[PDB]
Amino acid sequence: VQLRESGPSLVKPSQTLSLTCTASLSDKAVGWVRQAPGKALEWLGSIDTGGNAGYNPGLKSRLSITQDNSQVSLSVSTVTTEDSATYYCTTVHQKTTRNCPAGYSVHYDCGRASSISVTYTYEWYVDAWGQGLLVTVSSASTTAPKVYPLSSCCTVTLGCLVSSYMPEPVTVTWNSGALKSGVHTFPAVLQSSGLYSLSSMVTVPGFTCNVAHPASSTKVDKAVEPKSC
Amino acid sequence: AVLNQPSSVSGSLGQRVSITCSGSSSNVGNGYVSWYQLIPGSAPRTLIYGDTSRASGVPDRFSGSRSGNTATLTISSLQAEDEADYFCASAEDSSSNAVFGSGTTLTVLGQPKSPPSVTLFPPSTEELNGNKATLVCLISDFYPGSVTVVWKADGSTITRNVETTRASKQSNSKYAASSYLSLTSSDWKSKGSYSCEVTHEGSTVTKTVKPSECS
């Protein structure tokens, strides 16, 4: 089972943000969890099979979740600088069990007779998580990156240089996911001009990086080969 | 509106470690606490659901518990791959309203130190065609994560135009960092040797590039 999150990685302040979640989707509910950078996880909401949607009480007026029975869309209106977070789509299990003590006697519709109040237990846990999606919140400007191949001067070390771009993030995949053993993508550095710059090297004992920059809708493929020497 | 967790929790290698999730009667009082593990570079991992029930593919060392309004997560025989952020969560007043924990960072002590792996790349020919040069120095797989970086040009210490990132923790408990020397194209071919000197726990690793013998 897989789970993909789609949407814009950039949204300006005072603007509605809309995401979309697709997965391989009616056995369990679908939930949304966001994590502010350097903060705890934040429960946003969910929607079950029957269509019942639950929201976080602190933000219930701001966000809304729609579903088309296999895409669940989360819409948080009037974004701000505090909404910049990684939004995980998740399949969460929800179940409300009204419990009664020993005797097997329960009833609703407002020994057989009982004077013990009905206390209920709410079952909740995230079954499966998604890879995630970072949505940044700033006016700024989408500046695309320039990719340059990296090779030694003469194991063998190669890589790619994702230079001069904004805003974050950037996903660098080597060989469209085929090359994964030996790949190391470093975090970006913030230069004086205000643009980020990261690298992604691959170590070989004895090659085409696929750099994607979502804010500019950019997907550049760069072939890398060691120097002739 | 977040469940109280300890900020930092440190345990020795192979030893026990407990993480308390101090809550109230509406959330942890409802007997359905869940636990989650957050490893850098990976999607969050569901550890325990419903107080004591382990998830799929989680070892027996990860045991969950709760006494009244307080749930704890116990990690026995702690390893280096257990270093992560752990969060507790439970429903509150509704099956679709859940609150998480403040977070607990697990740092496992007793790990052996490792020297940094330094790699220095010259400016690409394609970038040199725009009258610009950027030297990329990549440092990876060093523990602990304190690394001091200095550049040199033919023995003379560089200071200007240098931007170095902080040590980011890798997936294997070790740390990584990068350093960039943005230069003018004339400034790249204006020296004989450029060195990325990396110092870590006294042991210094250095890589050197020479524009004359690098084509």
TrEMBL record, chain B:
Gene Ontology, cellular component aspect: extracellular region; immunoglobulin complex; plasma membrane
Intrachain S-S bonds: 21-88, 137-196
Annotated ranges, domain Ig-like: 1-107, 116-210
UniProt keyword Electron transport present: no
Keywords, sorted A to Z: Adaptive immunity, Cell membrane, Disulfide bond, Immunity, Immunoglobulin, Immunoglobulin domain, Membrane, Pyrrolidone carboxylic acid, Signal
Subunit structure: Immunoglobulins are composed of two identical heavy chains and two identical light chains; disulfide-linked.
PANTHER family assigned to the protein according to its UniProt record, in alphabetical order: IMMUNOGLOBULIN LIGHT CHAIN
Record's protein name: IGL@ protein
Species in which this protein is naturally found: Bos taurus
Source species taxonomy: Eukaryota, Metazoa, Chordata, Craniata, Vertebrata
Gene name of the record: IGL@
